[PDB]
Amino acid sequence: AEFVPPPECPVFEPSWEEFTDPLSFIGRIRPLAEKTGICKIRPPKDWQPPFACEVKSFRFTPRVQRLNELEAMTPREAFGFEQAVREYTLQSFGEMADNFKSDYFNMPVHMVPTELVEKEFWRLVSSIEEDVIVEYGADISSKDFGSGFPVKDGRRKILPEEEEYALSGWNLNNMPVLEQSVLAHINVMKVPWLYVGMCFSSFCWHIEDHWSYSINYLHWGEPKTWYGVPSHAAEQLEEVMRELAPELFESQPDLLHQLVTIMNPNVLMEHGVPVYRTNQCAGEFVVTFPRAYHSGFNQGYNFAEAVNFCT
Numbered sequence: 001a002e003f004v005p006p007p008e009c010p011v012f013e014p015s016w017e018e019f020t021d022p023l024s025f026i027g028r029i030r031p032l033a034e035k036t037g038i039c040k041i042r043p044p045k046d047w048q049p050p051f052a053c054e055v056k057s058f059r060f061t062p063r064v065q066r067l068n069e070l071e072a073m074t075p076r077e078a079f080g081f082e083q084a085v086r087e088y089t090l091q092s093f094g095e096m097a098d099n100f101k102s103d104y105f106n107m108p109v110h111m112v113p114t115e116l117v118e119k120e121f122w123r124l125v126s127s128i129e130e131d132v133i134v135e136y137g138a139d140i141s142s143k144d145f146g147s148g149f150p151v152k153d154g155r156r157k158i159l160p161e162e163e164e165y166a167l168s169g170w171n172l173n174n175m176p177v178l179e180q181s182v183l184a185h186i187n188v189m190k191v192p193w194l195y196v197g198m199c200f201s202s203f204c205w206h207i208e209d210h211w212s213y214s215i216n217y218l219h220w221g222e223p224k225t226w227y228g229v230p231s232h233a234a235e236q237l238e239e240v241m242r243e244l245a246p247e248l249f250e251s252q253p254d255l256l257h258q259l260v261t262i263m264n265p266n267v268l269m270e271h272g273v274p275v276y277r278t279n280q281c282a283g284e285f286v287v288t289f290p291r292a293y294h295s296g297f298n299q300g301y302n303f304a305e306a307v308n309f310c311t
């Protein structure tokens, strides 16, 4: 039986008046969005930040992801030496990514329906006959090659028409990140992270450290498909995860288990866990709420930026 897409999470299209401050905006939509775990925010049509990373020198070593690593658990000869991590440029990764997807589906990359990639992704995760391997540029600090948003740190040129985006509250470098505590006063910081995706590259189910919010922006490229679970269902999801996990992993601390918590959304739904989905397209924000479990994968070559923030 083929994958059944979860219902769509809310999408908001604020006018310019409502698009003033992200914390005030998220506070207003919270009564609805906290009940779906994730939501999507489309900025006003005329809000188009330039892309401001150092593209000429952009280089990275993406992690290798084997889609069915879990279903193949329960030894193959020379396991552990399948594929080495190597260095790409932004350009050379994109050539590889588009070639992979167009080859895989036998059609131009921009013509593959989002629902077809979604169906194939979940089929491959559980398949013991097809061993698909992809790569994910997922460990890239904005401090390395700069943020995708313009930043007024004097390291890179900003045009007059771009200064607005350097100062915008929706620029992820201008989100509040400091958690309130007494230790924070007794002590004598965080920056955005970047994600360069290809078709089928993915993030497993997790919640943020300290149950933090996160905000996520897709700078350009093909969509990022998301699944989210409201915080009221967090303990339920955790129970399902431990019920259906391999016993070798069921007892592991959550912070380690989250490295390998791959689970088809339909399985959670059949166990009574509410799941919502969305395709985040270029120029759109996704916000995750405190203790909202989420997971997802990329439809093709794309570039995202994300940060944890505090309210």
Ligand SMILES: CCN(CCN(C)C)C(=O)c1cnn(-c2cc(C(=O)O)ccn2)c1-c1ccc(OC)cc1
Residues within 6 Å of the ligand: 136, 138, 139, 195, 202, 203, 204, 206, 207, 208, 209, 224, 258, 294, 296, 304
């Ligand atoms: C689990 C918490 N965590 C550990 C932090 N510890 C080390 C301190 C994270 O790093 C983290 C937080 N969110 N998050 C994420 C990423 C995306 C995306 O890929 O678009 C979408 C939504 N969330 C990630 C992530 C990073 C890399 C990754 O590689 C495959 C997969 C997930």
Ligand SMILES: [Mn+2]
Residues within 6 Å of the ligand: 206, 207, 208, 214, 288, 294
């Ligand atoms: Mn996350």
